[PDB]
């Protein structure tokens with residue numbers, strides 16, 4: 227069993243918890259306590275490898291250690307929250323600085339894609355992710371669209387960066 231240490235970051239309210247809980251429990255939780263920061267484990271087979279994902283859902287001693295030793299990052303904004311998208315810069319800078327590197331496994335996630343009349347269009351997100359050299363994936367924690375894709379792609383990005 228190979229462990230992968232994953233960190234979910236982004237502005238409060240974007241769906242970091244709802245995404246994590248979909249991955250772990252396959253349901254959509256409407257109002258998960260926005261103050262709870264914790265780690266979760268999930269056993270999953272990805273490309274014939276049995277993975278034990280160690281995931282921090284950020285909301286701290288524990289956060290500092292996951293930032294320092296985390297292998298990959300899901301940087302989440304919501305497609306109907308322009309501010310959360312603009313804030314991605316701050317999260318990306320935080321990660322670059324803890325790892326002293328521009329080359330960190332990361333996926334840009336645009337969540338809440340089930341909601342109408344987005345204020346962040348897909349091209350804007352593609353543009354930002356292209357500048358950072360990382361994938362962009364749309365998700366809905368409500369419908370589960372893209373949830374497995376976002377996490378599996380992050381695991382693949384970690385492999386692309388380092389032997390595991």
Ligand SMILES: Nc1nc2c(ncn2[C@@H]2O[C@H](COP(=O)(O)OP(=O)(O)O)[C@@H](O)[C@H]2O)c(=O)[nH]1
Pocket residue numbers: 237238239240241242243244245255256257258259260337338339340341365366367368369
């Ligand atoms: N419609 C929709 N609502 C969502 C989605 N993800 C999260 N939410 C809602 O957005 C709010 C914040 O979600 P939450 O997971 O707590 O965000 P966190 O602070 O980033 O962990 C809650 O009301 C969730 O039900 C989604 O993909 N679609």
Ligand SMILES: [Mg+2]
Pocket residue numbers: 242243244258259260261262283284285
């Ligand atoms: Mg949360």
